[PDB]
């Protein structure tokens, strides 16, 4: 019996709200809100807490990190990153929490730093080849993937994907996606890397393609029910959930999950209270 939480976001500005969805009972409730307004952040589940890394507070790009205790229902704040990061990707790999890319917001970032629960400290690792804002990340088989995003240097949305090996500490390009996807919803399900939605300028996609690390090839699956960009993505019990986002104009309150067995996207029977974009999601136990 797991629960899914949605942290912060825009609606239409930075908020503090954090909603929770009970699967067994099909309902959305409010839990302990953030200590501060936060959106465009990286939200991960590192055993056994939920982390909110970087982001935007409606006025400034932040480097702070907040941690949630699903038992006492309260937020505490750990060590802040070295750099301010907004619209970044965050994931866990080999007991390390990586903060990937983001916005300064004077410049797009190619730098990556990792956090250790052991030392409570952020340290830089090898930077990406291309700076990426509005980037999504995923971890497959001890590898860290930075999917698409936006490059301020060349001024265009990216179709390139990079791979990070913690053993060698260097980034390499892999197979480019079928199209340019900025702010795509990135998740991992059954060893497969998913790139959902995203956008290139004003065009928001509902198409989804999936990467196979073994073959280094992208293949297309079923389109989502709706065009989504900047949505929250997490997977649980063989299903990949996509939460909120926006269609380039309006923030969405709908949530849909993907079933790789049947190749289907299914809407949740109950939308969120308030439509959110750039909100992070994670799954814990109640």
């Amino acid at each position: 019996p797991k629960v899914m939480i949605v942290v912060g976001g825009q609606a239409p500005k930075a908020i503090r709200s954090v909603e929770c969805y009970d699967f067994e009972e099909d309902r959305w409730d409010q839990i302990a809100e953030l200590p501060s307004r936060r959106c465009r952040a990286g939200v991960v589940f590192m055993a056994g807490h939920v982390y909110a890394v970087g982001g935007f507070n409606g006025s400034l790009r932040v480097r702070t990190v907040d941690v949630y205790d699903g038992v006492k229902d309260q937020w505490t704040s750990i060590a802040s990153m070295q750099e301010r990061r907004s619209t970044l990707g965050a994931a866990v790999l080999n007991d390390l929490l990586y903060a990937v890319g983001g916005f300064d917001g004077s410049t797009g970032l190619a730098s990556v730093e990792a956090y250790s629960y052991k030392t409570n400290e952020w340290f830089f690792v090898a930077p990406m080849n291309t700076r990426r804002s509005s980037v999504g990340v995923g971890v497959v088989e001890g590898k860290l993937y930075a999917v698409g995003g936006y490059d301020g240097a060349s001024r265009q949305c990216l179709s390139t994907v990079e791979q990070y090996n913690p053993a060698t500490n260097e980034w390499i390009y892999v197979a480019d996606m079928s199209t340019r996807r900025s702010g795509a919803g990135v998740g991992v399900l059954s060893g497969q890397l998913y790139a959902t939605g995203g956008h290139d300028g004003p065009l928001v996609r509902k198409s989804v393609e999936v990467y196979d690390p073994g073959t280094n090839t992208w293949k297309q699956v079923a389109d989502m029910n709706m065009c989504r960009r900047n949505a929250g993505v997490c997977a649980v019990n063989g299903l990949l959930y996509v939460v909120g986002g926006d269609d380039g104009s309006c923030n969405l309150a709908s949530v849909e999950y993907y079933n790789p067995v049947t190749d289907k996207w299914t809407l949740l029977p109950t939308n969120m209270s308030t439509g959110r974009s750039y909100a992070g999601v994670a799954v814990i136990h109640k």
Partner: peptide, 10 residues
């Protein structure tokens, strides 16, 4: 800085 995200500033 600008409230908008980098990609939307474009």
């Amino acid at each position: 800085e600008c409230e908008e995200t980098e990609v939307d500033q474009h």
